[PDB]
């Protein structure tokens, strides 16, 4: 019954391209009832959502791995806007029966994140990643995720990505939006590259933002269980339990490569030069900066 929604071109909601299966009955997102205690993990897709979600859930468990093994991260951290009409309950429905503090995954741009989150002052942890690696990760993600419009070739996908036509829209608007919205809201704004550089440093910042104290032992336990290699091999976090007819894990696994700089293995010389010129124009007039190396 969900099949008619899969592998369809993007729908649109509030002017933002949307996963086809997610777009119907969008009032469930507009009118989502948040709780003041909700923790929002917000990202442009493929920017480290799963990685930070597992860290957050681990902090809430005091660093105990086994409370995070009992269920897959897609059930422990539902995505707000997820829907699979006729096969699965929506993310919003699932969240209503979760005890507090709810950890809420979402990829919505800040200006269409449900206004309840802003009015309850919910803590938001945003994760940004450099646009080149995001493009690469999101291309391979769409090759394997049947919810997505098929991306065709990489060169055509990169063009769509730069023009903000992919699901959830313009990367440039997405990352700048949450960067500026911290002026009126508590937002911890993390960078994927900083987490590659020094993961324990970034865990400590997440912990302080959530008001949690971590012993030295728990910090090491969290870092040990959120390494790329650990999360790739963990069935609870590597999405290998998602059914085959929704994600073709053989095309590309979710825990694909987990590095910074895989763009160098995908951008052609020409694509790289054209991207850099366009990026520099788009990112002028913001102090927000990312690292590609
Ligand atoms: N512990 C970890 N360390 C590093 N990268 C991780 C990671 N867990 C997930 N990732 C990477 O995060 C990306 C997925 O992002 P999201 O969780 O927002 O969907 C993928 O990037 P790659 O496709 O470049 O490998 C995935 O490999
Ligand atoms: O399920 C998805 C669809 C599109 C982008 C990210 C995710 Br996660």
């Amino acid at each position: 019954t969900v099949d008619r929604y899969l592998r369809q071109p993007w729908s649109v909601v509030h002017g933002i391209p949307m996963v086809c299966a997610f777009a119907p009955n969008w009032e469930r997102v507009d009118n989502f009832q948040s709780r003041p205690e909700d923790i929002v993990v917000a990202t442009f897709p493929k920017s480290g959502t799963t990685w930070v979600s597992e860290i957050v859930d681990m902090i809430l468990q005091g660093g105990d791995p086994e409370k995070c093994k009992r269920d897959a991260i897609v059930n422990r951290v539902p995505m707000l806007e997820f829907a699979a009409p006729g096969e699965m309950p929506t993310g919003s429905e699932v969240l209503a029966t979760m005890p507090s503090p709810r950890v809420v995954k979402s990829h919505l741009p800040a200006h269409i994140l449900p206004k309840s989150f802003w009015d309850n002052g919910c803590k938001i942890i945003y994760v940004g990643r450099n646009a080149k690696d995001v493009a690469v990760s999101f291309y391979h993600f769409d090759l394997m995720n049947k919810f997505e419009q098929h991306p065709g070739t990489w060169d055509q996908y990169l063009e769509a990505f730069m023009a903000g036509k992919v699901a959830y829209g313009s990367w440039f608007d997405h990352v700048r939006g949450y960067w500026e919205r911290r002026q009126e809201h508590p937002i911890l704004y993390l960078f994927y590259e900083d987490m590659k550089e020094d993961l324990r440093r970034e865990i400590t910042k997440v912990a302080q933002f959530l008001g949690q104290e971590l012993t030295e032992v728990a910090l090491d336990a969290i870092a040990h269980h959120t390494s790329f290699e650990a999360m790739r091999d963990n069935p609870s976090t590597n999405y290998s339990t998602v059914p085959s007819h929704l994600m073709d894990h053989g095309v590309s696994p979710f825990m694909r490569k987990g590095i910074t700089g895989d763009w160098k293995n995908h951008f052609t010389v020409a694509q790289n030069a054209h991207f850099d010129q366009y990026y520099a124009q788009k990112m002028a007039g913001t102090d927000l900066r990312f690292r590609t190396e």
Side-chain angles (χ1 to χ4, degrees), residues 1-65 67-68 70-293:
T1 279
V2 65
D3 294 338
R4 78 185 47 91
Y5 293 100
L6 303 177
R7 288 299 188 202
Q8 294 296 343
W10 317 116
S11 314
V12 59
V13 297
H14 305 294
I16 299 298
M18 191 37 63
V19 180
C20 182
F22 299 173
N25 308 128
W26 195 254
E27 73 265 29
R28 78 189 186 279
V29 175
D30 289 332
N31 309 126
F32 179 77
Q33 181 60 30
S34 72
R35 304 170 192 171
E37 295 83 1
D38 290 337
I39 304 165
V40 177
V41 179
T43 63
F44 188 85
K46 302 288 104 187
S47 300
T49 317
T50 307
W51 185 20
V52 174
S53 295
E54 187 66 22
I55 291 172
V56 171
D57 201 56
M58 204 70 153
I59 288 170
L60 298 180
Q61 297 317 5
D64 180 72
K67 296 180 176 67
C68 299
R70 51 95 188 273
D71 282 313
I73 191 164
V74 85
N75 295 126
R76 289 185 284 112
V77 183
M79 177 173 36
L80 171 64
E81 65 270 19
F82 175 79
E87 169 157 0
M88 293 193 127
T90 71
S92 63
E93 277 160 353
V94 176
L95 285 167
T97 75
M98 311 267 320
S100 294
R102 303 184 300 179
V103 182
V104 181
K105 172 169 82 166
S106 181
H107 303 299
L108 296 177
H111 68 287
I112 69 172
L113 193 72
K115 321 317 218 263
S116 179
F117 294 108
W118 307 114
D119 283 339
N120 288 324
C122 301
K123 295 183 289 302
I124 299 173
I125 300 169
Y126 187 85
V127 193
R129 192 181 185 184
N130 83 58
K132 293 179 183 179
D133 283 333
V134 170
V136 172
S137 184
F138 199 25
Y139 175 70
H140 296 262
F141 186 68
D142 292 352
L143 289 173
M144 66 83 72
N145 187 346
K146 274 47 163 303
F147 283 92
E148 301 291 281
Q149 169 174 348
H150 193 275
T153 69
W154 160 249
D155 185 69
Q156 294 285 309
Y157 182 80
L158 178 62
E159 184 185 11
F161 183 92
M162 311 184 285
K165 307 296 182 179
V166 300
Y168 295 102
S170 170
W171 179 86
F172 303 95
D173 297 341
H174 204 285
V175 297
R176 285 178 66 160
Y178 279 90
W179 180 253
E180 284 178 23
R181 291 291 288 269
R182 80 182 196 273
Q183 180 181 356
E184 292 92 346
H185 197 84
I187 296 170
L188 174 60
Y189 191 148
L190 299 174
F191 305 64
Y192 175 100
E193 289 82 9
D194 296 344
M195 302 174 74
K196 293 298 296 181
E197 198 184 20
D198 188 352
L199 177 57
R200 291 177 19 111
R201 179 182 63 195
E202 307 298 320
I203 298 168
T204 297
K205 289 159 82 193
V206 176
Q208 183 176 1
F209 185 65
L210 298 177
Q212 285 285 0
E213 286 287 347
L214 288 177
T215 62
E216 293 80 11
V217 165
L219 174 60
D220 295 331
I222 298 170
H224 182 269
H225 282 278
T226 60
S227 70
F228 174 77
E229 294 84 4
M231 301 190 65
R232 179 192 62 194
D233 299 334
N234 186 0
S236 177
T237 59
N238 65 8
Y239 284 63
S240 64
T241 65
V242 172
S244 179
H245 82 110
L246 296 178
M247 288 166 133
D248 187 338
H249 309 284
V251 175
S252 181
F254 192 92
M255 302 294 161
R256 188 179 65 85
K257 271 192 177 229
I259 65 165
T260 292
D262 188 56
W263 62 271
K264 298 180 187 291
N265 293 318
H266 292 86
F267 288 52
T268 65
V269 173
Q271 288 170 349
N272 197 35
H274 183 266
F275 194 90
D276 289 336
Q277 189 150 15
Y278 182 71
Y279 187 94
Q281 152 74 329
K282 291 294 290 182
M283 288 309 252
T286 184
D287 54 350
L288 179 60
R289 291 146 20 240
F290 306 66
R291 293 183 292 173
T292 58
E293 277 116 326

